[PDB]
């Protein structure tokens, strides 16, 4: 049986403030820039539709230097931090970014048509761009988040598999890391393994996995450590309706239509796909630059940061403007030529985080020791995530008890 943390955790009246100064990231919005001979990255990939996972490290309160010590007994008490307030400051102006493919697989525009496509070609690919759906989300926890996507499965060995067959599909749960791609209006699938022509989705997702958070599995966890708080807001609509070009994997049944003649002797493509569009960004619909108070979590864990560790996941596509840069090769010409200038694309992104923490103490009795050991063995030993990449935040040297000297501390003292 799982019990709430409010039973075996005692909260004191000591509060601390923590915060980062400013985080910046500048890079190419579509692909990394790499040296031709080498494999070392010169310009990383920074996009507005990437998961931002911050892993925050806290001081050990047992070894922390407090002006007063009489409030607890080190012989039978142990200390831990609790989160009571978070703000995610978000710079840059509001904007919308677009992406596309120079060789995207589009056959025809089927929204309105007046002639029939009676002849097939060798290459019908086009240069198409669009803007993605609108999404904001924030997740806070003490364990890394969990996402889901569609991937290939293991086929049965009863019958053989011929080239060109439909791959089998299964649903896969993984851990979201820093730099992953969010859904853009095409689904949560592995585009590298489920698409072979490399020309069906834009350039920044054509060789990546799009993942969606697994809210149902996260909230059903018995201990509720992976999610203390979450906000989400997403929207989209359809702008264009197209076809796809290729060979027909599955034929239309003969009892759904009447055969034609002349131009309509053969059938056109039935692999319709839409073009997504986020509508419009406004200041009134923003979930950032606002303080969140963590009064009572939904799960049994109520903001206790076991292991001196915090995880913050952020997605915000409402500031995704890409900047165009131009450099002149030769300036000794008074008439414009296309070949005298070079074009570049850049994206910059700005972050700020600030937190209010409360000090708690735990009495280690035999029953409490047994329960905590059953919950997590490493906690007692201290008194794994080495193959994942997160944005590391080190707050071991940024705490202050002067709570009213900071913007978030003033609000915290004002609400109470």
């Amino acid at each position, epitope marked *: 049986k799982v019990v709430s943390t409010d039973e075996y955790v005692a909260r004191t009246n000591i509060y601390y403030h923590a915060g980062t100064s400013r985080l910046l990231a500048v890079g190419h919005p579509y692909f990394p820039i790499k040296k031709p001979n080498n494999n070392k990255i010169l310009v990383p990939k920074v996009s507005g539709l990437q998961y931002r996972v911050f892993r925050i490290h806290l001081p050990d309160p047992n070894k922390f230097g407090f002006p007063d010590t009489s409030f607890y007994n080190p012989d039978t008490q142990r200390l831990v931090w609790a989160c009571v307030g978070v703000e995610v400051g978000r710079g840059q102006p509001l904007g919308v970014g677009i992406s596309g493919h120079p060789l995207l697989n589009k056959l025809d525009d089927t929204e309105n048509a007046s002639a029939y496509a009676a002849n097939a070609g060798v290459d019908n690919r086009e240069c198409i761009s669009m803007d993605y759906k609108q999404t904001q989300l924030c997740l806070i926890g003490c364990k890394p988040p969990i996402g889901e996507h569609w991937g290939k499965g293991s086929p049965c060995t009863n019958v053989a598999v011929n080239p060109g067959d439909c791959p089998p599909l299964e649903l896969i749960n993984t851990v979201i890391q820093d730099g992953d791609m969010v859904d853009t209006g095409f689904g949560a699938m592995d585009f590298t393994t489920l698409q072979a022509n490399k020309s069906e989705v834009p350039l920044d997702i054509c060789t990546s996995i799009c993942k969606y958070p697994d809210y149902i599995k996260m909230v059903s966890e018995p201990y509720g450590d992976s999610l203390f708080f979450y906000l989400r807001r997403e929207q989209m609509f359809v702008r264009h309706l197209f076809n796809r070009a290729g060979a*027909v994997g599955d034929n239309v049944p003969d009892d759904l239509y009447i055969k034609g003649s002349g131009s309509t002797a*053969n059938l056109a493509s039935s692999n319709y796909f839409p073009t997504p569009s986020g509508s419009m960004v406004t200041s009134d619909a923003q979930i950032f630059n606002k303080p969140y108070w963590l009064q009572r979590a939904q799960g049994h864990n109520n903001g206790i940061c076991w292991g001196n560790q915090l995880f913050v996941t952020v997605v915000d596509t409402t500031r995704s403007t890409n900047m165009s840069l131009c450099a002149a090769i030769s300036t000794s010409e008074t008439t414009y030529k296309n070949t005298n200038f070079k074009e570049y694309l850049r994206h910059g992104e700005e972050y700020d985080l600030q937190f209010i923490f409360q000090l708690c103490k735990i009495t280690l009795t035999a029953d409490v020791m047994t329960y905590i050991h059953s919950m997590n063995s490493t906690i007692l030993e201290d008194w794994p995530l080495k193959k994942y990449t997160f944005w590391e935040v080190n707050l071991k040297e940024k705490f202050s008890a002067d709570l009213d000297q900071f913007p978030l501390g003033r609000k915290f003292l004002l609400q109470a």
Partner: antibody, heavy 122, light 107 residues
Framework: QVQLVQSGAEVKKPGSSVKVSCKASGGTFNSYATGWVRQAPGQGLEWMGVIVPIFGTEDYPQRFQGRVTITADESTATAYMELRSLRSDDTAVYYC???????????????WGQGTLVTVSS | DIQMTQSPSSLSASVGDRVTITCRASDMISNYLNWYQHKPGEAPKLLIYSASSLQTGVPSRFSGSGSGTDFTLTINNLQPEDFATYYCQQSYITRLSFGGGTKVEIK
């Protein structure tokens, strides 16, 4: 240029099934539409079936539905024709007609096989 | 399906003559007609497609014209290599069909 090569002559008994192949040898083909024709001793030409893998088309005449199957393999560029429930009137010479992608229509059958003789008798 | 009728079924001509073959369709098939030439011991060979267009590598002495339900093939200045069997073919629907065939012979 490209040449289509067909399998050898077949001798079958009534009630059996036969299968004939058609392979493109020179260059790279990238076939467009495949069809089969036949000629009986002392008769004309009879269309027996067409497949157009693009557009997903597969059509056979009414008198031949249920006994004729036409298949194409793009990895090896080989066409196959299957006849079931052979009769004594199926003794004939069979021709493989194919069209290449990049032409102006699907019915520009400019490539033909040499023909295969099939004799159904006991 | 569509039935096609080819006339005549046989004719005799001499070198240097003009030969016309008429082809009639059971329905309106626009210009979806092709003409094929067949010789003994060889595969059929395409001459005219879409009832007007001339296949590459074919002498200009061959011509074809028609539309609707009536079509015709004309051969001017007949040569010794033109003596073969000629067939219609409709491609209006994906269930294609052939004509009866006309055999040209030596007078």
């Amino acid at each position: 240029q490209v040449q289509l090569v067909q399998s050898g002559a077949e001798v079958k008994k009534p009630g059996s099934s036969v299968k004939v192949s058609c392979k493109a040898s020179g260059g790279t083909f990238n076939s467009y539409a495949t069809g089969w024709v036949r000629q009986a001793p002392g008769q004309g030409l009879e269309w027996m079936g067409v497949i157009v893998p693009i557009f997903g088309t597969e059509d056979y005449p009414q008198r031949f539905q249920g006994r004729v199957t036409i298949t194409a393999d793009e990895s090896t560029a080989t066409a196959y024709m299957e006849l079931r429930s052979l009769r004594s009137d199926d003794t004939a010479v069979y021709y493989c007609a194919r069209s290449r992608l990049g032409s102006s229509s699907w019915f520009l059958f400019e490539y033909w096989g040499q023909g295969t003789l099939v004799t159904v008798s006991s | 399906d569509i039935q096609m009728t080819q006339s005549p079924s046989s004719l005799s001509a001499s070198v240097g003559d003009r030969v016309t073959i008429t082809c009639r369709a059971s329905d309106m098939i626009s210009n979806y007609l092709n003409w094929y030439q067949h010789k003994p011991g060889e595969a059929p060979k395409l001459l005219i497609y879409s009832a007007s267009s001339l296949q590459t590598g074919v002498p200009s002495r061959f011509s074809g014209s028609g539309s609707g339900t009536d079509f015709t093939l004309t051969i001017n200045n007949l040569q010794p290599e033109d003596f073969a069997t000629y067939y219609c073919q409709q491609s209006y629907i994906t269930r294609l069909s052939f004509g009866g065939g006309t055999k040209v012979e030596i007078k």
